[PDB]
Write a protein that binds this DNA or RNA. Structure first.
Ligand code: FES
Ligand code: K
Ligand code: K
Ligand code: K
Ligand code: K
Ligand code: MG
Ligand code: MG
Ligand code: MG
Ligand code: MG
Ligand code: MG
Ligand code: MG
Ligand code: MG
Ligand code: MG
Ligand code: MG
Ligand code: MG
Ligand code: MG
Ligand code: MG
Ligand code: MG
Ligand code: MG
Ligand code: MG
Ligand code: MG
Lengths: 168, 119, 52, 110, 108, 77, 86
RNA sequence: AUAGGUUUGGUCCUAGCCUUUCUAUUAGCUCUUAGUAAGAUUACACAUGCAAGCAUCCCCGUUCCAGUGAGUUCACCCUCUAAAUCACCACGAUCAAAAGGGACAAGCAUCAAGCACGCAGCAAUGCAGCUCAAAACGCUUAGCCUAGCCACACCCCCACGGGAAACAGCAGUGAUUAACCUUUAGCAAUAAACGAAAGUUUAACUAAGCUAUACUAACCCCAGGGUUGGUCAAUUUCGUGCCAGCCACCGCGGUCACACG
RNA sequence: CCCCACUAUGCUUAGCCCUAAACCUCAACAGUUAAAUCAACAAAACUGCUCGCCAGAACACUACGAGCCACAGCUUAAAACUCAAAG
């Protein structure tokens, strides 16, 4: 089997389930949690399950964790303008934390669909080229048009071998 | 790549196999190869008539108007495709080449007539 | 990532530019013409037939 | 406002302070292992400009990219000391703390 | 192992594939030097026609002539190929029949 | 193709390309057609150039764009 | 191989035993039939009124061979070969 | 991998090797037609011919296309900002070099230390640091992440200078290698250069020639190659007698050879 | 191999050498006895976490290189040829 406890965390299907896509302002995210204490239980589960999901969606965001530096856990974000966003996460579950930072610093569903829609316009169906970029390579793949000579030989009147011979 | 000088141009990039040509309209640098790297593909042109006897020509007018406004030039064959469509005026030589054909065919009607008349 | 300097490429560049300014040809040499063969002796190039 | 430096804001830890008005900071980022699909810390060293030389080895600091590198390796500057070594102040309560214990009870100031 | 140990090491490094007597080439051209016979190892017993040739690379190895009878002499040209001679130990090359001086085995 | 350093062929040494003959009528009529065609196209090009300048300025400095940048900053506070 | 094949094929839990075990409906979801829920088995005894507690993350041991295939990483020139009817 | 053969007197386990599949090159035997695609082994040396001209003189162009893979983390993103295009002033856009930041191949740690690789300061000048087992420095190998890109352009990284007299442009030749395309035609199409333009030029390209290397299709006449102990589809009769010979693995052959001919 | 005799050595002191079947051939911390207990033998079968180590046999407790009060030494440690087994 797959090593480690909860091996599903190390899967692309689980890393892409994160719904926290930070904005352009967020630059650094610092997590301070305590290894023990009933109050900090959620913060530990948030570092064990969701940090992988957050860093996968925000690869250009620095995430640094510190253990047992304060009596209580908390999150702190550092924006590009110089503003700091403190977030007390004591006495909260990992879902409440994941849902709370999505409302104050995460993008909404309206801002995401737009970005995706732009990409669809990058691949024009009318264009012809390699299969990697375009759907069709040549226009002989379109019924009605003249087929490729490799498959269907052209008439002797349409080949430059005989056009020259017929003329001379 | 960086070319000394040069400019963008909207030309035709030949494609297809032997005796089966297929041009694809593209905006590419002036010095780049004919079928090499391009900035954007702005249409396609199938010279050979289809079953219906018609030549197909695709044009991304919204993008052709963008590159012409960014400093792009046009090739003579491509300026004759935009004149046949009504996007540009009929190229001067598309008109003069038609007049030359008229006089040429009228010059052949004389010899044909004389032969049938004289002989 | 530290590119190794090419000093001879800069030395010759300066020398060439200098010589192009000290040995530059004059308008008497460049734009001369032999009125029998109609060629510029500097380059040995014929003029267009419409200028003869 | 726009600068020629890639990393604008980064958090690190002072590892050395043996250069004049300069602090050597170690920055860690999580990097995904493509095969194991697990994140590991990839660290990197950054040179920060400290005018007052108030940094101490072992403290967390915040760096701000400079408009242009003042030196060959110095591209950032000390914005603020997040956690001072041994004298951290709880941001939630504003009270001193030594680890997971309060040095000054938060109830003193209600 | 552990995930941390598997990350430090990295993807398995496949040992560099070793080259054979032909040095990763289908065939090779060589000149004949000698024509002797060698006895195979147990459980077999025979006299197998072999020849020492100098390849174009510069080496000088031993080769096995397949077929019944041959007319190979010194200084002749032959084309060799791969293929272990199972009975003969240390013989990794085989002569190609009907190429250059080497002539196709006469019928019967 | 050749370079500046490559020499010339010996078959093109004594070569003279004579210009084509001119039809006075067609030459003049065709010389005006290019004059108009190129003037009609110079105007079209200027039109399209003004549309590319507009959109860019509109995008970074527009009414709608600046009406949304303030909404996103107000919602942040 | 044979002694183990018969061993696992005899210790497999059917849909009826599962329902009776947990007192819940066993619903079948098929892509060809859309979102239609198909009841394949129901408990004979008292149907439970409380649902199963939804689990955020399941602690089930996975197989790298299956996960490596679902991610387009198991390259093999011997898998998915055209063979005769069986 | 749906796996299979092979350790032993025999069994189980472990393990390596090999077989079965799909491509490419060369060799042997053999080979009917048509269309299409592709097409030196060698950065070794090259006979001949051609490959850049245009144009009322100036300028522009020959810095492109084409070619090769010697060398090799200059190829990507951001910032800033020249040249160039948008007739022109300006505008901003487009495109994009230099500079600054970041990212970026493989193998060897029996390459473990590198030896000036740092910082401050207007300057003078001062401090003594910088990189590295989370792999510095170093050796070796390799064109790459392919709508294409990078690098090279006889050699000395460069090219004033020197050696010295150059096909890694097309066709072609010598040497070399297991490796082998014609010393065709035309600028009619497209592209590029020049011209105000009609137009001119182009071994780019287009249309042909050669080659079972591959794909497609077909043919009244026209089929060979390998294999036949097991894995693995398929042998009758003679000859040979551990000799001659065969095998991808296990092995056959000692006068009854389904394994050699 | 058996008997007798005797020496280095076994002991003390001051230094060096740094090896072993240095093997209880069974790593450290925490935890479990239920499920499929479990190839065989041996000292029943497993979980979590971490470090170290091994990837066919032989060549090889070898060669070269480097380091070490070690100079017939120790540590680190390959390759070519060979086999279809070894275990
Ligand atoms: S591919 Fe379209 S003609 Fe051959
Ligand atoms: K035998
Ligand atoms: K000119
Ligand atoms: K190369
Ligand atoms: K023991
Ligand atoms: Mg090129
Ligand atoms: Mg640059
Ligand atoms: Mg060594
Ligand atoms: Mg190379
Ligand atoms: Mg051809
Ligand atoms: Mg017999
Ligand atoms: Mg036989
Ligand atoms: Mg004694
Ligand atoms: Mg003793
Ligand atoms: Mg002991
Ligand atoms: Mg041990
Ligand atoms: Mg230990
Ligand atoms: Mg071994
Ligand atoms: Mg020893
Ligand atoms: Mg030794
Ligand atoms: Mg030694």
């Amino acid at each position: 089997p797959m090593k480690g406890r909860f091996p599903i965390r190390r899967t692309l299907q689980y890393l892409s389930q994160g719904n926290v896509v930070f904005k352009d302002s967020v630059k650094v995210m610092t997590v301070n949690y305590n290894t023990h204490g009933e109050l900090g239980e959620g913060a530990r589960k948030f570092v064990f399950f969701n940090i992988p999901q957050i860093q996968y969606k925000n690869p250009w965001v620095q995430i640094m964790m510190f253990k047992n530096m304060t009596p209580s856990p908390f999150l702190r974000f550092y924006l590009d303008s110089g503003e700091q966003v403190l977030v007390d996460v004591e006495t909260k579950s990992n879902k409440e934390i994941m849902e709370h930072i999505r409302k104050i610093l995460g993008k909404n569903e309206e801002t995401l669909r737009e970005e995706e829609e732009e990409k669809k316009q990058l691949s024009h169906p009318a264009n012809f080229g390699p299969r990697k970029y375009c759907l069709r390579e040549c226009i002989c793949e379109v019924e009605g048009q003249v087929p490729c000579p490799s498959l269907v030989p052209l008439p002797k009147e349409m080949r430059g071998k005989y056009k020259a011979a017929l003329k001379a | 790549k960086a070319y000394r000088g040069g400019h963008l141009t909207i030309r035709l990039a030949l494609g297809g196999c032997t005796n089966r040509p297929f041009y694809r309209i593209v905006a590419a640098h002036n010095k780049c190869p004919r079928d090499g790297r391009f900035v954007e593909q702005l249409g396609s042109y199938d010279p050979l008539p289809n079953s219906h006897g018609e030549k197909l020509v695709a044009l991304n007018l919204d993008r052709i108007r963008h590159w012409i406004g960014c400093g792009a030039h046009l090739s003579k064959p491509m300026e004759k495709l935009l004149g046949l469509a009504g996007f540009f005026p009929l190229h001067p030589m598309m008109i003069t080449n038609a007049e030359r054909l008229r006089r040429k065919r009228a010059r052949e009607v004389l010899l044909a007539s004389q032969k049938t008349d004289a002989e | 990532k530290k590119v190794r300097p090419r000093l001879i490429a800069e030395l010759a560049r300066r020398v060439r530019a200098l010589r192009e300014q000290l040995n530059r040809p004059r308008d008497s040499q460049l734009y001369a013409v032999d009125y029998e063969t109609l060629t510029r002796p500097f380059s040995g190039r014929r003029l267009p037939v419409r200028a003869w | 406002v726009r600068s020629s430096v890639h990393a604008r804001w980064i958090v690190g830890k002072v590892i050395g302070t043996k250069m004049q008005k300069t602090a050597k900071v170690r920055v860690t980022r999580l990097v995904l292992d493509p095969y194991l699909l697990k994140y590991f810390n990839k660290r990197k060293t950054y040179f920060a400009h400290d005018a007052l030389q108030q940094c101490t080895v072992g403290d967390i600091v915040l760096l701000r990219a400079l408009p242009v590198p003042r030196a060959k390796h110095v591209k950032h500057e000390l914005a603020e000391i997040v956690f001072k070594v041994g004298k951290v102040i709880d941001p939630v309560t504003g009270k001193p703390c030594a680890g997971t214990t309060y040095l000054e009870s938060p109830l003193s100031s209600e | 192992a552990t995930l941390n140990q598997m990350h430090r090491l990295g993807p398995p490094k496949r040992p560099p594939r070793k080259l054979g007597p032909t040095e990763g080439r289908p065939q090779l051209k060589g000149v004949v030097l000698c024509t002797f016979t060698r006895k195979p190892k147990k459980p077999n017993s025979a006299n197998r026609k072999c020849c020492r040739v100098r390849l174009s690379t510069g080496r000088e190895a031993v080769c096995f002539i397949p077929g019944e009878g041959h007319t190979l002499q010194e200084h002749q040209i032959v084309l060799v190929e791969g293929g272990r001679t199972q009975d003969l130990p240390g013989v990794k090359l085989t002569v190609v029949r009907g190429k250059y001086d080497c002539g196709h085995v006469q019928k019967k | 193709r050749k370079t500046r350093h490559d020499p010339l062929a010996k078959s093109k040494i004594e070569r003279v390309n004579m210009p084509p003959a001119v039809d006075p009528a067609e030459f003049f009529v065709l010389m005006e057609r290019y004059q108009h065609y190129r003037q009609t196209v110079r105007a079209l090009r200027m039109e399209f150039v003004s549309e590319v300048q507009r959109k860019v300025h509109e995008a970074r400095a527009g009414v709608l764009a600046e009406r949304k940048a303030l909404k996103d900053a107000a919602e942040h506070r | 191989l044979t002694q183990g094949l018969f061993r696992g094929l005899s210790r497999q839990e059917t849909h009826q035993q599962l329902a009776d075990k947990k007192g819940l409906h066993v619903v079948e979801i098929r892509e060809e039939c859309g979102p239609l829920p198909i009841v394949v088995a129901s408990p004979r005894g008292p149907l439970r009124k409380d649902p199963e507690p939804e689990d955020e993350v399941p602690d089930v041991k996975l197989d790298w061979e299956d996960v490596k295939t679902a991610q387009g990483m198991k390259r093999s020139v011997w898998s998915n070969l055209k063979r005769a009817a069986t």
